[PDB]
Structure formats: C-alpha cells, structure tokens
Nucleic acid binder design. Structure first.
Length: 475
RNA sequence: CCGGG
RNA sequence: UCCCGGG
C-alpha cells in the first residue's frame, strides 16, 4: 500500500524485542542456515547500519491505480469467480449470531480466547477475556458499544503492529526482513466473523480446485485429491508473488468486495462495509502512526480467504487481459492466500502475463530461482504448495506431502521453553512422508532424550487417514 | 502446543 | 494476529 502520513505520536506501543525461540540439541547437529527473526533494532546478528523500523514498512511501495477499462475487466472477473463461488457454496450467508461468531460453527473454529485484543484495549492494559466471555459466547459493554458503531457504519480503528517471532532464513534475518502482523481489534474480528463467518465455513468445507481454494484442507489426506487432479494437465505452474498482501491495490480490493459480498448473494449490507474498512488503515508501531492506502492487513479475520479470492480473480484477469476467449474452464488452480498452483492443457505463457499482473501492482516470478523465466511442461511432482512437494508413496500408491529435509531441520533446531516434546510429536507427523531413513536421521539428535513416535505407527495412522479402506487390505 | 498461509 | 490442519 501507499503510505500517506507518518506523524509521530504521544502514546507508545512497545513490541516484544527478544525471541522465545531457543536452539535445541538438533541445532548443534544440523547447523541450519535459519534462525529467529530480528526483533530488536540493535540485534548483533543484523547487518551493521541497517535500522529495523525502516525495512519493516518498505513493502509499502504504493497503491497501483487501475484504468476504467482494467477495472471493468476486473469487475467482470470478480463477478465471474463470484458466480462460480456462490454456485458451489449456496447463498445462505446471513449474519452469524454473537454466540456463533465467538464459538465457531461446523467448518469455522472458535475465536482464540487469550490472543492479543488490539487497540485501543492494549493501551489500557486489558485482555480479551475482560472484553468477551468465550465460554458463554457473550460480550461486555465496550464491545457491544463498538458493535453498535459498526451497525451504523461509524466505527473507526487502528491496527497494532507486532513483529513476527518465527524462524526465518538467515539472509532475511541479517537483511532485517522480519514479517509483521497487523492485529485488528477483537470486536472487528468478531463482527467480520458475524458478517461473513458462514461463507468462510462453507469455503473451508468446500475446499478444492473447483472454488480454487485449499483453505481448510488437510495435506495428509488432501494431497491425494489435489495431486490426482493436477496430474491430468499437460502444464503446471508454481507462481511466487512479491509481498502479495501489501500490494493488493485499493481498486482491486474494493471491486472484489463489491462483487463477492453482495446482498443478492445473502450477505448483510455491512459485509461489504466491514471488509472495505481494510483498505485505508492506520497502523500503530511504538511512537509512530502510519496511515496506509491499499494492501491487506495480515492478521484480520478471513485474511487467508480474502487473499485466496484475490489470487483467483488475478489469474483470470491476467489471462483475459493477454488472451482472448478465456473462461474459468480454460485452466484450473488452487491457492492458499498468496500460495498458488495453476494448471492447463493450453500452453499459457506466464512470462507474458508478468506485465498484466503488474497492472494490479503484483510481481510474479517462478517458484524455482534458476531458469530466468517461466517454463512449460512442468508437472505436479515438480511444484511446492504449502511448503510441500507432491511425491507418490510407493507403499500405497497415493500422493503424500513431503517437506524439504532442510526445512524440517530448521523447524526441529528451534523451540520455545518446555514445548520440545510436544513439537517433536507434531513435527513427526510432517517428517513421516520423508520416508524411514530420513525420518530416523531427522530425530536422531533427540534419541535417549525425548519420546519419538515410531515411523511405522505414523505410517499406519496416515494410511488410515487417507481414505481408510486402503488400510483394510489385510493380506 | 506445533506446522502452513 | 488471523484463519487452516494436526495433537
């Protein structure tokens, strides 16, 4: 987005400063080129003379304005995808009750009861539990008063910027490219869930190529579904974006919201209104307040869904801007926010689409670094989706999500205090797909120290997970 | 609590 | 932080 104003200010929102991610015994063995993001501006691991506060917001390069003709084209694409979407999900998009929005429904998990509340509550020193009753599914006066302002479209808010405490490639650590998290007020999250929660629930439940969304999928089971779909196409592309979230233009966001969340598709009028409050935002980071036009706040309710929907419209838009007679049948895709796999029998030229995506403010590049440009004839077994390759399991003949051993090494190399046992169990569920020898090697550092699930036990669990009756081949 | 986006 | 998936 475009920074329009950055006045310094009285009140101060102090972040975090130091990581909770401490090295494990595995770190000494694998010595990964990965470490915790820089959270302090004076982190010695940083490159000298590189201030952390600058690079955080460098992603805000501007808010691409589109022509009348590009907007009408985009409107057509948004409406075309919307048609497909609401056809599959139905039109029961009436507001969720307060209770439902808090407690969730089938396809939509309940709100986190003790996550950050946002502004202005964090300046008062107050937790989510004080504002909202998560067991009961009810709200205090302050939230109800905010609820009332949103009804009448008079509600205004600020986003609380947090530095993301996570493992990053050391190049990005040293370059100070710590990701941020735009924390919205808990009431904003609540109302958004009220306005579009059922839609979201339906999306999650209906995940797959048809709606072009993997939000809600379970890679253990769904890799067989997705893998077999995409293997039917002659060409598959693995597309990377540069700062996807920041670079959604005001025009694209507004038109997408206008076409997808219409009252004629069952939504309350304020579905459109509440989503449109994400366009022009005020961000609070320490003593500064930054006003941004364009871009999606990473950490609002349904950020993943909104990004996924945009991804879908972008691909349609870019193809129709370059080629003639392009429809939704012309290709297939699945995305998860900025992450995307696209396939087609037509030999599309994604190199030629680069400028057409640029007209939206988005920079596409191939997922592999080498080979200067996009290439034809790539298959499903060459691409990364959700940091997972599609490899055929030779025991069952099903697709399994394989993570790169270097990534698993990095994950296993760091942990927060007193979680190591728990993390190992969780990560073993990722690592089983790398096969027995690699599984043994990844956990070898932890032997004698923690309980490591046997390879065999997780393999049988998985064989049941994918279908179930494949397990019931007792010969 | 862990992974992914 | 938001969702998603798994304990």
């Amino acid at each position: 987005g475009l920074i329009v104003d950055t006045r310094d200010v009285e009140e101060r929102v102090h972040v975090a400063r130091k990581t909770k991610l401490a090295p494990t015994v595995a770190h000494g063995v694998f010595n990964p080129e990965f470490g915790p993001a820089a959270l302090s501006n004076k982190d010695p691991r940083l490159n000298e003379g590189v201030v952390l506060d600058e690079v955080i917001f460098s992603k805000h390069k501007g808010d691409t304005k589109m022509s009348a003709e590009d907007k009408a084209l985009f409107r057509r694409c948004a409406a075309d995808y919307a048609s497909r979407l609401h056809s599959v999900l139905g039109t029961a998009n009436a507001p969720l009750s307060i209770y439902e929005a808090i407690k969730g429904v089938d396809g939509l998990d309940a709100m986190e009861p003790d996550t950050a509340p946002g502004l202005p509550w964090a300046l008062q020193g107050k937790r989510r539990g004080a504002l909202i009753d998560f067991e009961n599914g009810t709200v205090g006066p302050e939230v109800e008063a905010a609820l009332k302002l949103m009804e009448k479209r008079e509600y205004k808010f600020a986003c609380q910027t947090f530095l993301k405490d996570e493992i990053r490639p050391m190049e990005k650590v040293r370059a100070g490219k710590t990701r941020i998290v735009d924390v919205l007020p808990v009431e904003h999250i609540l109302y958004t869930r009220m306005m579009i929660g059922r839609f979201c629930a339906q999306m999650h439940s209906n995940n797959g190529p048809q709606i072009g969304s993997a939000v809600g999928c379970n890679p253990d089971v769904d890799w067989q579904r997705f893998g077999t779909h995409f293997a039917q196409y002659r060409n598959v592309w693995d597309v990377d974006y540069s700062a996807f979230d920041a670079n959604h233009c005001s025009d694209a966001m507004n038109i997408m919201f206008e076409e997808v969340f219409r009252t004629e598709f069952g939504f309350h009028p304020n579905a459109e209104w509440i989503l449109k409050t994400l366009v022009n935002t005020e961000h609070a980071y320490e003593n500064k307040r930054i006003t941004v036009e364009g871009g999606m706040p990473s950490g609002c309710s349904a950020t993943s869904i909104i990004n996924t929907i945009l991804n879908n419209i972008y691909v349609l838009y870019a193809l129709r801007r370059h080629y003639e007679g392009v429809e939704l049948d012309t290709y297939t895709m699945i995305s998860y926010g900025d992450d995307i796999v696209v396939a087609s029998d037509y030999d599309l030229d994604f190199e030629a689409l680069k400028p057409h995506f640029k007209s939206l403010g988005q920079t596409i590049t191939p997922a592999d670094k080498s080979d200067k440009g996009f290439v034809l004839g790539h298959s499903i077994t060459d691409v990364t989706f959700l940091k997972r390759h599609f490899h055929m399991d030779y025991g069952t003949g099903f697709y399994k999500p394989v993570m790169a051993s270097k990534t698993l090494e990095a994950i296993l190399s760091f942990a927060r205090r007193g979680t190591i046992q728990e993390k190992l169990i969780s990560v073993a569920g990722l690592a089983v797909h790398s096969g027995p020898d690699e599984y043994r090697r990844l956990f070898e550092p932890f032997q004698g120290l923690f309980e490591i699930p046997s390879y065999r036990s997780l393999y049988l669990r998985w064989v049941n997970a994918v279908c179930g009756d494949a397990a019931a081949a007792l010969e």
